[PDB]
Design a binder for these strands. Structure first.
Ligand SMILES: Nc1nc2c(ncn2[C@@H]2O[C@H](COP(=O)(O)O)[C@@H](O)[C@H]2O)c(=O)[nH]1
Ligand SMILES: [Mg+2]
Ligand SMILES: [Mg+2]
Ligand SMILES: [Mg+2]
Ligand SMILES: [Mg+2]
Ligand SMILES: [Mg+2]
Ligand SMILES: [Mg+2]
Ligand SMILES: [Mg+2]
Ligand SMILES: [Mg+2]
Ligand SMILES: [Mg+2]
Ligand SMILES: [Mg+2]
Ligand SMILES: [Mg+2]
Ligand SMILES: [Mg+2]
Ligand SMILES: [Mg+2]
Ligand SMILES: [Mg+2]
Ligand SMILES: [Mg+2]
Ligand SMILES: [Mg+2]
Ligand SMILES: [Mg+2]
Ligand SMILES: [Mg+2]
Ligand SMILES: [Mg+2]
Ligand SMILES: [Mg+2]
Ligand SMILES: [Mg+2]
Ligand SMILES: [Mg+2]
Ligand SMILES: [Mg+2]
Ligand SMILES: [Mg+2]
Ligand SMILES: [Mg+2]
Ligand SMILES: [Mg+2]
Ligand SMILES: [Mg+2]
Ligand SMILES: [Mg+2]
Ligand SMILES: [Mg+2]
Ligand SMILES: [Mg+2]
Ligand SMILES: [Mg+2]
Ligand SMILES: [Mg+2]
Ligand SMILES: [Mg+2]
Ligand SMILES: [Mg+2]
Ligand SMILES: [Mg+2]
Ligand SMILES: [Mg+2]
Ligand SMILES: [Mg+2]
Ligand SMILES: [Mg+2]
Ligand SMILES: [Mg+2]
Ligand SMILES: [Mg+2]
Ligand SMILES: [Mg+2]
Ligand SMILES: [Mg+2]
Ligand SMILES: [Mg+2]
Ligand SMILES: [Mg+2]
Ligand SMILES: [Mg+2]
Ligand SMILES: [Mg+2]
Ligand SMILES: [Mg+2]
Ligand SMILES: [Mg+2]
Ligand SMILES: [Mg+2]
Ligand SMILES: [Mg+2]
Ligand SMILES: [Mg+2]
Ligand SMILES: [Mg+2]
Ligand SMILES: [Mg+2]
Ligand SMILES: [Mg+2]
Ligand SMILES: [Mg+2]
Ligand SMILES: [Mg+2]
Ligand SMILES: [Mg+2]
Ligand SMILES: [Mg+2]
Ligand SMILES: [Mg+2]
Ligand SMILES: [Mg+2]
Ligand SMILES: [Mg+2]
Ligand SMILES: [Mg+2]
Ligand SMILES: [Mg+2]
Ligand SMILES: [Mg+2]
Ligand SMILES: [Mg+2]
Ligand SMILES: [Mg+2]
Ligand SMILES: [Mg+2]
Ligand SMILES: [Mg+2]
Ligand SMILES: [Mg+2]
Ligand SMILES: [Mg+2]
Ligand SMILES: [Mg+2]
Ligand SMILES: [Mg+2]
Ligand SMILES: [Mg+2]
Ligand SMILES: [Mg+2]
Ligand SMILES: [Mg+2]
Ligand SMILES: [Mg+2]
Ligand SMILES: [Mg+2]
Ligand SMILES: [Mg+2]
Ligand SMILES: [Mg+2]
Ligand SMILES: [Mg+2]
Ligand SMILES: [Mg+2]
Ligand SMILES: [Mg+2]
Ligand SMILES: [Mg+2]
Ligand SMILES: [Mg+2]
Ligand SMILES: [Mg+2]
Ligand SMILES: [Mg+2]
Ligand SMILES: [Mg+2]
Ligand SMILES: [Mg+2]
Ligand SMILES: [Mg+2]
Ligand SMILES: [Mg+2]
Ligand SMILES: [Mg+2]
Ligand SMILES: [Mg+2]
Ligand SMILES: [Mg+2]
Lengths: 14, 122, 46, 97, 95, 166
RNA sequence: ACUUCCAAUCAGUGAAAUUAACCUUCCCGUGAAGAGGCGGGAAUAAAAAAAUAAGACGAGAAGACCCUAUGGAGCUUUAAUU
RNA sequence: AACAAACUCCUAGCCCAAUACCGGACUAAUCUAUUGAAACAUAGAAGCAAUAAUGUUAAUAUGAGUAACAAGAAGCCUUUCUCCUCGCACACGCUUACAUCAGUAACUAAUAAUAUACUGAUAAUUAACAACCAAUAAACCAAAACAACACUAAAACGUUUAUUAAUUACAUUGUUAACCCAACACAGGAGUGCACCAAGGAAAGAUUAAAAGAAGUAAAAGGAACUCGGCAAACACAAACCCCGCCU
RNA sequence: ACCAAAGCUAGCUCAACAUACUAAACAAAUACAAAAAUACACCAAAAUAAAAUAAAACAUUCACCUAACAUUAAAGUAUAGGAGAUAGAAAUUUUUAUCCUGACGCUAUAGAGAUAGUACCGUAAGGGAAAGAUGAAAGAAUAAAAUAAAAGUAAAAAAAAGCAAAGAUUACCCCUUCUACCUUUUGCAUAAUGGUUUAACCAGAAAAAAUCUAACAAAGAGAACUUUAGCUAGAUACCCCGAAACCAGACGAGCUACCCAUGAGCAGUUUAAAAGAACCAACUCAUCUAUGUGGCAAAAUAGUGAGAAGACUUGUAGGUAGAGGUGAAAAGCCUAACGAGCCUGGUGAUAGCUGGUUGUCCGAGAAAGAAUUUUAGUUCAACCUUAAAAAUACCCCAAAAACCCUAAAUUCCA
């Protein structure tokens, strides 16, 4: 299976 | 994405979105597509004559004020109708059925400036 | 090919899909508005 | 592990206020009073806990039975979920069986 | 076994134990030998008698059944013409 | 935050009794929240350590670093304060006894990388502390000579004791 | 062979995977069966800078191959209830 | 012989190892009831103790001052030279990021200079273009493609007649921008009408000219001998034989 | 010496009483594309809860599970149950008015998510924060006092050799000795897992039978019961994180799959041609190679390619929604993860599987026989621990234990 991990962005406030 | 807190005014849409800013209408659309303005729909400012008016926007500083006595319906009735009713009752000609001669209006649909429907802006 | 730009803005689509009238025209959208009101959202719809 | 650098204000607690002087004064109201009142009636607190004691599951069950008809929606939902979790844990989990 | 019921908060008992077991007040548990009604034509008279006889339970099984049952089944019963009233008590047990 | 380099300049000594040698003047100055980096400023601080103020200014004028001008301004301000406030004549009679660089309060930003990843970019700020002492610079330590090395070796040989013996 | 981008130095700004602590050699042998850390020997002033990738069973992803789970799910039926 | 233990003596004692599970005595830090009053005692309670969960949050280090990032030149200071050419407007979209003045120690520009991208104050987009801008019955088969006349796939786009359409200047709304969607001041994605410059901009922060890497140019004699394959490249850019799918 | 550290408040939590319960604002505009004064209508709709789980599987069953009758007992009784797991009444009994209500609850990683459902993240349903600290006076900032105590640095870079320490020593190294720590294993320095470090949070919970202590005792208990020394009371006990999944209802066709309306593009050359013809632009795709691989880019750049009047590309708007849609079937696409979307709720789902599980000292201390969809696990037995009763316990000479031959030696015994 083509498993991919989407990046998660840090909260903009910090 | 687009905003949600901002106000949805006529500047934020396409050409086909032409929303008014709150001004009252002044006419309709005529025959060949033009706008026909109705004279009666345009407000007419009833401005008095201030040439001989002896009052100014500010009062004298030493002028005394008065105790706050807001005008009530009871006071208005006592001032406008109570003396007439008392005099007529003393004379003996008082007619309870007919009160239109004393300023009472049984129906507001007749006169120009109606009170409950509020036919006048200001 | 390249993704990430799946949002192409358009006010007509935005208002016709998530507008106040669109929400209130169906019983489920009224429930959505009630849920947002209960949570205390500043904006109930677009 | 940083600890404060100043002396805290020493609490001037007195042992002879009204509550401390009259603490549990009528604890023997029955025994010394020709029984009419149990020491249960002197307990002030929730309605479902006056003169009663039980573990968490029994307390939740009693609260739901007694005052469950006046609880808020989320409070009643939380009580039901807690009752279910406690039932499952007590009747299906543990070591001594 | 339900250690804490959902209605009363009490401890429940399994009905199979009381349906197929009997407890004397001294703590012993009485039971019937398994297979005493199965294929009697195939068994010797001595084996049939052994199956018909009542038997007791050991300490582990007795404690298990005590755990499964509640305190209502360990009480002292004074029945009218009880067959096991003479066996309810234990005598001359030197331990 | 901590601010004690400012307060180190406000101490007052009791008057010196006659016959006591004159106490050299000590002047503490510092610049806070400099955009230039901590280690990069430490390099210049170490460069100008222990030399006369005029020599330090001479080096910092022709240094190509960005912090060279900041350190030069700090040194000039310290010299002016030493002449004016403190009773220090001979504005050229000061030497840099201490010259240190520390870190201040940083700012955290996002550095974009690719594939939707990111890093924590840190906007560095530094403090520069300088302490000047009135008087000629102390002489630099000379490398240990062969005679001194032999003397210490012989002394360590003579310091021996018979361990675990008595 | 020569140009440009790279590269190295100078000046400014300045991340990432990774990291038990390291004062982080070589050979033979031993050992959870392929040792920088054990044993027997050799080697051994200390620090930079630039390169090459043999090793750290290198980093990355709680192997996707294999097996187990009285763990799932998709599909097909001549599987069992319907 | 000697040297050689958790063995055994010697001198004192508090007088004999340990994993899973089991038992006991003390005890750190909180709250309460009574003591105490330079921080404790007896009791009763628990959110009652962290060198370890690819533990959560925050800050800090290593990698590392490393990878990476940028402004054509001179000049009288915004005037001339050297180069490359996606420019103007409308629609959709963002909403003041636009303009004037002033400041930039720091915050935005992945660095400065200063400024369309930061800060403050003050101003601004003016309708003729665009949006909202008649119904009810009837006559009406005969395409657009320079449309003369035709083909098939049979084709959006209209006047007139009759009945009613408040009738009377000036209504309302969009008018900035260097801009939108992609976390970013992103080498990507973006409809239409005009021309290929009369409009837009700058590949190089400054040096040196190590290795390795990317792109290009040229190369003696040979011309596929390389390689899975003539992949890539080339002063070539031609002709054939099969397998499988009829073909677009 | 920097970085930093410490306040005590904002406020929260749990109950009692309670008027009897969608607060204040509502001048105008607000369900036209909400906050847009103003035209001949149409309006309304109901149809069971399901499943995750337990029965060590799973089909009948599986308490609570947004429907009132509360409390003391009857009673976990009668009954209902693949009669298994479990579920579970009723008849009949008890309940005296009001104040005496605050806290052996928290103090900014705690207590509500909250300074706030706000910034921010998503098209939407939805998710969702962190951030405060001087003083009587800052109309006392040429401002005054307490800590200068974490990790990280500087003051002050290093000198053969070695889990970095210990024995020591006049003396830092030099000498001698020790294979980091948890977890899992028959066994780990192992090159098997985990961790850069600091600070703050993070994991054993129940009283049936039993043991101890105490009250009273043939009776005990403040009502309903138990009693052939028993009854009453108290103290001793049973963790945390993690799936793929399943069900229900919302939100999604602004990307993409296919349709429906409404528009727009294709310049030049060869051809009686606008021929699903040919060359080749704009334009649409993406054959091959090289860079790039935390990149310009969560799919790009350069070169090179295919189509380019059509089964063509494309703008705007509408429709089809998950037990489905759509599909020139690739089990493709349906808002960057689709053998079937995402969000919320069930939900603290469930894991015989992995990981973790926090003070000191002392005593004793275990390597497996039988069942079992069972051998990755449980329940018994044999061992072992903690208390209590007793009396024989191991070592064990004779004598004794099979018949064709048979060793080491066994069993039972003074
Ligand atoms: N089953 C069993 N395991 C043991 C026994 N003794 C030690 N173990 C196991 O052996 C490991 C520790 O090894 P040890 O320290 O005994 O050498 C642990 O996993 C422990 O549970 C035993 O007697 N029986
Ligand atoms: Mg948004
Ligand atoms: Mg508009
Ligand atoms: Mg527009
Ligand atoms: Mg007009
Ligand atoms: Mg997105
Ligand atoms: Mg991106
Ligand atoms: Mg960093
Ligand atoms: Mg880091
Ligand atoms: Mg790590
Ligand atoms: Mg070394
Ligand atoms: Mg070896
Ligand atoms: Mg050795
Ligand atoms: Mg060695
Ligand atoms: Mg040798
Ligand atoms: Mg290598
Ligand atoms: Mg190693
Ligand atoms: Mg390898
Ligand atoms: Mg590896
Ligand atoms: Mg694995
Ligand atoms: Mg694999
Ligand atoms: Mg497979
Ligand atoms: Mg199994
Ligand atoms: Mg299942
Ligand atoms: Mg069949
Ligand atoms: Mg010896
Ligand atoms: Mg000994
Ligand atoms: Mg205590
Ligand atoms: Mg704790
Ligand atoms: Mg800690
Ligand atoms: Mg990792
Ligand atoms: Mg940790
Ligand atoms: Mg660094
Ligand atoms: Mg540099
Ligand atoms: Mg490096
Ligand atoms: Mg570089
Ligand atoms: Mg440039
Ligand atoms: Mg924007
Ligand atoms: Mg501005
Ligand atoms: Mg800058
Ligand atoms: Mg414009
Ligand atoms: Mg450059
Ligand atoms: Mg080269
Ligand atoms: Mg080359
Ligand atoms: Mg060439
Ligand atoms: Mg050649
Ligand atoms: Mg060949
Ligand atoms: Mg060859
Ligand atoms: Mg080729
Ligand atoms: Mg050829
Ligand atoms: Mg060819
Ligand atoms: Mg074909
Ligand atoms: Mg053909
Ligand atoms: Mg099950
Ligand atoms: Mg289970
Ligand atoms: Mg299964
Ligand atoms: Mg199952
Ligand atoms: Mg259910
Ligand atoms: Mg039946
Ligand atoms: Mg069964
Ligand atoms: Mg908080
Ligand atoms: Mg420190
Ligand atoms: Mg050593
Ligand atoms: Mg070993
Ligand atoms: Mg083990
Ligand atoms: Mg193994
Ligand atoms: Mg190994
Ligand atoms: Mg190993
Ligand atoms: Mg493993
Ligand atoms: Mg390891
Ligand atoms: Mg571990
Ligand atoms: Mg690791
Ligand atoms: Mg008990
Ligand atoms: Mg199921
Ligand atoms: Mg649609
Ligand atoms: Mg669409
Ligand atoms: Mg053409
Ligand atoms: Mg063609
Ligand atoms: Mg390309
Ligand atoms: Mg090329
Ligand atoms: Mg091309
Ligand atoms: Mg072609
Ligand atoms: Mg062709
Ligand atoms: Mg299914
Ligand atoms: Mg389908
Ligand atoms: Mg197929
Ligand atoms: Mg297939
Ligand atoms: Mg998706
Ligand atoms: Mg779990
Ligand atoms: Mg198993
Ligand atoms: Mg021991
Ligand atoms: Mg056992
Ligand atoms: Mg014998
Ligand atoms: Mg014997």
């Amino acid at each position: 299976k083509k498993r991919f991990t989407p990046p998660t962005y840090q909260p903009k406030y910090k | 994405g687009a905003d949600r807190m901002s106000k949805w005014t006529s500047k934020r849409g396409p050409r086909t979105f032409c929303k008014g800013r709150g001004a009252k209408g002044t006419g309709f659309h005529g025959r060949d597509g033009k706008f026909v303005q109705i004279k009666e729909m345009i407000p007419e400012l009833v401005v008095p004559e201030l040439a001989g008016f002896k009052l100014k926007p500010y009062v004298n500083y030493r002028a005394p004020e008065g105790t706050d006595t807001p005008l009530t319906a009871k006071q208005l009735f006592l001032e406008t109708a109570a003396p007439a009713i008392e005099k007529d009752f003393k004379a003996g000609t008082f007619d309870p059925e007919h009160l239109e001669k004393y300023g009472f209006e049984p129906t507001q649909e007749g006169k120009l400036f109606q009170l409950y429907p509020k036919n006048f802006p200001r | 090919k390249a993704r990430g730009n799946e949002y192409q803005p358009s006010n007509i689509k935005r208002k016709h899909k998530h507008g106040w009238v669109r929400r209130l025209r169906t019983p489920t959208g009224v429930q959505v508005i009630l849920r947002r009101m209960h949570k205390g959202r500043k904006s109930l719809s677009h | 592990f940083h600890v404060r650098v100043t002396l805290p204000p020493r609490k001037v607690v007195d042992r002879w206020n009204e509550k401390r002087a009259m603490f549990g004064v009528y604890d023997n109201i029955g025994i010394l009073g020709n029984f009419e009142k149990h020491p249960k009636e002197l307990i002030k607190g929730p309605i479902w806990l006056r003169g009663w004691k039980g573990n968490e599951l029994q307390r939740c069950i009693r609260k739901k039975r007694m005052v469950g008809n006046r609880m808020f929606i989320d409070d009643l939902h939380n009580l039901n979920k807690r009752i279910s979790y406690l039932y499952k844990h007590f009747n299906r989990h543990g070591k001594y069986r | 076994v339900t250690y804490f019921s959902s209605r009363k908060g009490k401890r429940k008992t399994v009905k199979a134990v009381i349906y197929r077991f009997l407890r004397l007040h001294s703590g012993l548990w009485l039971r019937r030998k398994a297979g005493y009604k199965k294929k009697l034509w195939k068994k010797t008279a001595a084996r049939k008698r052994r199956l018909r006889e009542f038997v007791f339970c050991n300490k582990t099984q007795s404690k298990l059944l005590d755990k499964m049952t509640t305190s209502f089944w360990k009480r002292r019963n004074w029945y009218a013409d009880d067959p096991y009233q003479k066996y309810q008590d234990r005598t001359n047990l030197k331990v | 935050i901590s601010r004690k380099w400012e307060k180190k300049n406000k101490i007052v000594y009791p008057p010196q009794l006659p016959g006591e040698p004159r106490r050299p003047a000590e002047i503490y100055h510092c610049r806070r929240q400099i955009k230039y980096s901590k280690d990069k400023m430490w390099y210049l601080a170490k460069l100008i350590r222990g030399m006369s103020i005029d020599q330090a200014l001479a080096q910092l004028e022709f240094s190509d670093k960005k912090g060279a001008q900041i350190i030069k301004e700090v040194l000039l301000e310290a010299q002016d304060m030493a002449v004016r406030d403190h009773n220090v004549e001979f504005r050229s009679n000061l030497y840099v006894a201490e010259s240190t660089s520390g870190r201040g309060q940083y700012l955290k930003r996002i550095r974009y990388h690719g594939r939707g990843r990111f890093g924590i970019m840190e906007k560095v700020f530094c403090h520069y502390f300088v302490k000047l002492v009135e008087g000629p610079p102390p002489p630099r330590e000379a490398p240990k000579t062969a005679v001194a090395h032999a003397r210490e070796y012989i002394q360590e040989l003579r310091n021996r004791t018979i361990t675990h013996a008595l």
